[PDB]
Design a protein around this ligand. Structure first.
Ligand code: HEM
Ligand code: HEM
Lengths: 717, 717
């Protein structure tokens, strides 16, 4: 190999290929954001004229463009494939992917094989982004072009939510190890797909449309449809609703050989202006379009909503054939329905065709039972496509407070993890003071208060903005019984105590003030950090924002919440079994999911350790001789060159630090030691380990802790 | 080949390996900085008791630590090598390298081979940094330790300035193409060393202590030293003074086999806490230490400033031999000097030894008379050394206004590109605003105004902070006939039209207020920009700050301003020969040297296009029909899908954009089109191309233009 200029990719990653990459803790840095620091997209969208945006979109859908003429003179279908592919990268394991950041316009997703032709699809909406400017993000516009497409073609959607903030540097997500497009190195066992992935091959949204590995077997393809969709929050009924209702519109494109198709956008020459997949077949567009290489037209009304798709799937029998590019697809046997399917540009009619994956809705017994009922009762299909399409293009929006606009329905949806609305006067500065003191007298230790508070709030992840302390769910299933949160039972004693305090406060309160459990969980950790700063000779108040309310078990989807459990949390020195990488990489990934910077991550580790927040209260990293005191001792001792460190003899992932006498003074994990070893983190430890650093250490730790307690509080922003 | 998790370095560089890398425009992001936004290092280092610091560094130097015992009981020489290596990465071609950022504490410099065992040298200064905290940067400290060490051991230095701010992420710099340490792929012809490097192998500071490619030919090593040191801005006399000066102290370390020496710090295990090159030879430290493999001790006074080096070099005859690690070195003939050189731990005492690099001082012609002189005139050695060492260590610190502390001598130095201080008074606001008219009322157009301003300020590189507009040096050589600056065009006409009004404003005689040329070059472009903005319905005011003064040709080292000649500047669509990478890369690179953000680069290019700023006022990129109007036109037309780009049939590295009618309407270069092709740039373009964007673009343009005019103005901080 050869080392390159940094402007062409070079860097220290090339000299130490598996080195921690701290650039994950500064994604989308403000230096790259062209908008001012005072710019609030939510404020812009709140003033947008929806009825004008809609018409300008319908005006775009029905005005063909010579560089990509419109099938049946309507782009609606194409925009549905666009919105579905923007949302369709979402995966449940890490919450990443999805439409919430508009990431389909940047690499690598803009160049994914399955996003072929969507480069053109987005281009067609620039006239729309231009008329509306800073009031409309690309993220909102992309997904809204589909919801407008549906309504325009006969399907009344459930509603819509604006508020997706545009970004400027693509989020980096691990999409698989395969270095080859459409590669498959992601299965083991009996068809067990590698977590966190949610697609069968590198570059696909979900499944191969020619069946597994290209084997056009409907019954097997359905195993993949079932499972990739599951990993995208869709059950059997939602998946069938989605596939059916989607293919009620539009058509495939495979008019000619696929080896006539040029390089993907990110690899294209300059003169193409961001567009890729340029084809020398015929016009290279329109009647000669080559997208997937398949050539199917599911319905006889490609631009209206009706029950044609299932009528057709069930009213013919199907045999296997080749498209003009040689891809597998099915056709109606015995020349049935010849000439019955309309042409994208006026040519002769054609005869019905389906994909392998479409036959799976009839051949699979679960899906047969679902689709046959909709054949006989199509109105059930409308209701389920409404719900599933809503879920799909909103799944990563986070709490409802974040949904803006006049088309936002008012109904509770379990998959949003609802939280009740405030019912009483929120707790003021005088009651917050009283409660910090009541909690400090309750008998709960500093460690109990800070662990519970952290466990509740750190359940947030910024990929999809699920999780967090609002809801009160640390006392509901499944969070009460996550291994990290409750090794030996202390958690339910804390819960018990905090509920007595809330009850007695609420029955004595002045007037109509009431505190929720969810708030007292957070308030308690703020109360302990104050007490523990005082013990170190710092008088400081920890901020606190009331407003959380208490969700109920019935309002908490236990299985949906399953993906949020930490298999590893380095802030509590917790390392469960089965993580993809060593503990220090997981630490950074957890730091990334909490939207934390390296300085913020560094300060919270050191504080949490001396506060006793360690899982099982283990001594790993607890480099202090004070109890329940918020000092910067973690940083000072990490830098003590009078300690010698070796891997512990029991090969237990711990380290032994010996002082001059050869006696063991400290013990540590890989997560602790990486702060003294990694030359960027050690730099940060030298900041907080200096003699003049303890007041700054305390202030910056309070700020980082307050930032974690508020991660889901979009109700106050 | 396998894609990796981002946290482990994976990203879109893996799928398109030569793609354009924009993080180069957000090095040292703010969210990675642990110091506040309001952190003011200058205001901190001013508080420092400099005498106490010196005393503390002194106590470090004489207290051996057991994990790296001190040769001769004094870490002074180690600290000087440390300091020489921290500065000794500098190179004149890009002004990158040098001690200004303290980059030796980070990758890859912390792990370069020549920087061996300096990890322990930096580790020894932790008690000092700990004591002084935020009032003292590692950058200042590393360098200042070497200066203190000199004085400590008998050499009075010319002085020292503070003010090098610590950074928190490596600066990634091209250090060569070789993917092997000590590798060599940089030499073509006969000894021609690829620009813009300044060392003979990958991971070296200058040259190979065993002669070129290990050939201990002093005469041949002299060619490397000369060419190598000249690229770090040292001439024959400076260079001879540094080698003699440095090797007055200390020794080399090669006590046993180098394969007993473990991995370098960035590849070393966690438990080594940032250190590397751990060694199973004997104790692995001290008398058994191994750093380079050579075992030479130059002087009999290794902790004192003497002339013993040159009396040894000339008082003996040097024959070839080998250290205990297969290392080529030189030693006395005939068993001369037996026992005269003392051992660093009370050993028996040894014969004299030199490096091949050392013998270049006696074998080469030019070095031999520099040196033979000093053999009888150590007062001249001493004087040149302090002159050169001072420069070696402040080369990248920029304008002398930046030098902080009580140790800065006021003597002007020529390499500092000195600028006369504001003698008279400066123009107040009613004087500036009364003075723009008299530039507007000149045959000078925006094209000549706006451009010439740009050519002045754009002279600045952020790497070593040299160049810039202050100094009036555009009137002077070599910025006079810089092929970018004048295609033999209106520059003199604008120069003398401005001098004409310089002579004219000062001769007016209102009092003390005299006006500098330099200040008017800058002021021209400002008012021009104001006219353009009114030419487009914006009554605008472009900020302006007086203070520049005009230097003289006698105070302008011409050979030292050569390396500031842009072989490329995309911002005026210029591209000479020789550039190592395509146009778009050198656009990004030049914007990095300008300390510009990607939003800033974009708004700038867009504005300068529509102002004829372009080299030879060529039409490439000028996507507007107005002249000298300030619009976003460049962005709007860049996003015009009715335009069709293809390379120009003439293959000039240009393109044509036809409007469907087949007639070329726009033409452009790569630099122009990369903004409409690259997915991240086009995102920006689409902010400033939108309908509601015109005010913000002007607003953002003035701010970004202001930034470039004010780059070197450290004199107003
Ligand atoms: C197993 C599931 C699915 C498979 C295998 C699949 C595959 C495909 C393929 C291969 C194409 C056309 C590619 C080309 O143009 O060459 C397509 C088109 C399309 N897909 Fe699907 N898809 C699936 C699910 C969905 C879903 C969930 C939706 C939306 C809710 C959807 C909506 C559409 C639409 C509207 C088109 C028409 C595009 C146009 O008219 O230009 N598909 N699908
Ligand atoms: C052609 C130029 C130079 C070459 C090839 C060179 C080479 C070397 C080498 C190989 C070592 C051995 C380090 C070890 O094994 O411990 C060394 C040590 C040293 N160098 Fe140089 N050097 C050069 C210029 C300089 C300059 C310009 C200075 C200072 C102005 C300097 C100061 C020192 C000092 C003080 C040491 C001793 C450090 C100690 O005692 O640990 N050298 N040099």
């Amino acid at each position: 190999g050869h080392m390159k200029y940094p402007v062409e990719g070079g860097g220290n990653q090339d000299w130490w290929p598996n080195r921690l990459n701290l650039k994950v803790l500064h994604q989308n840095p403000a230096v790259a954001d062209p908008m001012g620091a005072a710019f609030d997209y939510a404020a812009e969208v709140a003033t947008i004229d929806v009825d004008a945006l809609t018409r300008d979109i319908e005006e775009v859908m029905t005005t063909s463009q010579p560089w990509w003429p419109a099938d049946y003179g309507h782009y609606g279908p194409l925009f549905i494939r666009m919105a579905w592919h923007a949302a369709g990268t979402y995966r449940i394991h890490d919450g990443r992917g999805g439409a919430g950041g508009g990431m389909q316009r940047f690499a690598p997703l803009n160049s994914w094989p399955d996003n072929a032709s969507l480069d053109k699809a987005r281009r067609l909406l620039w006239p729309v982004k231009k008329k509306y400017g800073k009031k409309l993000s690309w993220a909102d516009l992309i997904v809204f072009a589909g919801n407008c497409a549906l309504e325009s073609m006969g399907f009344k959607t459930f509603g819509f939510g604006f508020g997706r903030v545009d970004q400027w540097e693509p989020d980096e997500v691990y999409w698989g190890k395969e270095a080859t497009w459409l590669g498959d190195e992601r299965y083991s066992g009996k068809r067990d797909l590698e977590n966190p992935l949610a697609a069968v091959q590198m570059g696909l949204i979900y499944v191969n449309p020619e069946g597994p590995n290209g084997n056009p077997d409907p019954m097997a393809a359905a195993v993949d449809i079932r499972e990739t969709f599951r990993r995208m929050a869709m059950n059997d009924v939602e998946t069938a609703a989605l596939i059916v209702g989607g293919h009620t519109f539009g058509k495939t494109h495979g008019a000619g050989p696929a080896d006539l198709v040029g390089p993907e956008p990110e690899a294209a020459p300059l003169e193409q202006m961001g567009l890729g997949w340029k084809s020398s077949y015929g016009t290279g567009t329109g009647k000669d379009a080559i997208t997937s290489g398949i050539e199917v037209v599911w319905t006889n009304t490609p631009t209206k909503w009706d029950n044609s798709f299932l009528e057709i799937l069930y009213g013919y029998e199907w045999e296997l054939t080749k498209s003009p590019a040689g891809a597998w697809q099915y056709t109606a046997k015995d020349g049935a329905g010849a000439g019955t399917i309309p042409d994208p540009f006026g040519g002769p009619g054609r005869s019905p065709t389906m994909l392998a994956t479409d036959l799976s809705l009839r051949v699979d017994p679960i899906y047969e039972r679902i689709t046959r009922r909709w054949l006989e009762h199509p109105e059930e299909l409308a209701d389920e496509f409404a719900k599933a399409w809503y879920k799909l293009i909103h799944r990563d929006m986070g709490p409802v407070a974040r949904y803006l606009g006049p088309l936002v329905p008012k109904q509770t949806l379990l998959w949003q993890d609802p939280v009740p609305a405030v019912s009483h006067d929120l707790v003021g500065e005088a009651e917050i003071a009283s409660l910090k003191s009541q909690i400090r007298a309750s008998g709960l230790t500093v460690s109990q208060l800070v662990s519970t508070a952290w466990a509740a709030a750190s359940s947030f992840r910024g990929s999809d903005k699920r999780g967090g302390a609002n809801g009160g769910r640390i006392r509901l299933q499944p969070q009460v019984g996550w291994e990290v949160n409750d090794p030996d039972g202390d958690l339910r004693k804390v819960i018990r105590t905090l509920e007595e305090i809330q009850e007695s406060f609420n029955s004595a309160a002045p007037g109509n003030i009431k505190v929720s459990f969810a708030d007292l969980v957070v308030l308690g950790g703020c109360a302990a950090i104050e007490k523990a700063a005082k013990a170190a000779g710092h008088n400081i108040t920890v901020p606190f924002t009331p407003g959380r309310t208490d969700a109920s078990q019935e309002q908490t989807d236990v299985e949906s919440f399953a993906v949020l459990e930490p298999k590893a949390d380095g802030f509590r020195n917790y390392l469960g079994k089965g993580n993809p990488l060593p503990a220090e990489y997981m630490l950074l990934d957890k730091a990334n999911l909490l939207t934390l910077s390296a300085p913020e991550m560094t300060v919270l580790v050191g504080g949490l350790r001396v506060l006793g927040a360690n899982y099982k209260r283990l001594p790993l990293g607890v480099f202090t001789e004070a109890s329940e005191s918020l000092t910067n001792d973690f940083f000072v001792n990490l830098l003590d060159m009078g300690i010698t460190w070796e891997p512990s003899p029991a090969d237990d992932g711990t380290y032994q630090g010996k002082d001059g006498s050869g006696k063991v003074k400290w013990t540590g994990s890989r997560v602790d030691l990486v702060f003294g070893s990694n030359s960027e983190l050690r730099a940060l430890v030298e900041v907080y380990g200096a003699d003049d650093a303890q007041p700054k250490f305390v202030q910056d730790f309070v700020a980082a802790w307050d930032k974690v307690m508020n991660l889901d509080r979009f109700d106050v922003r």
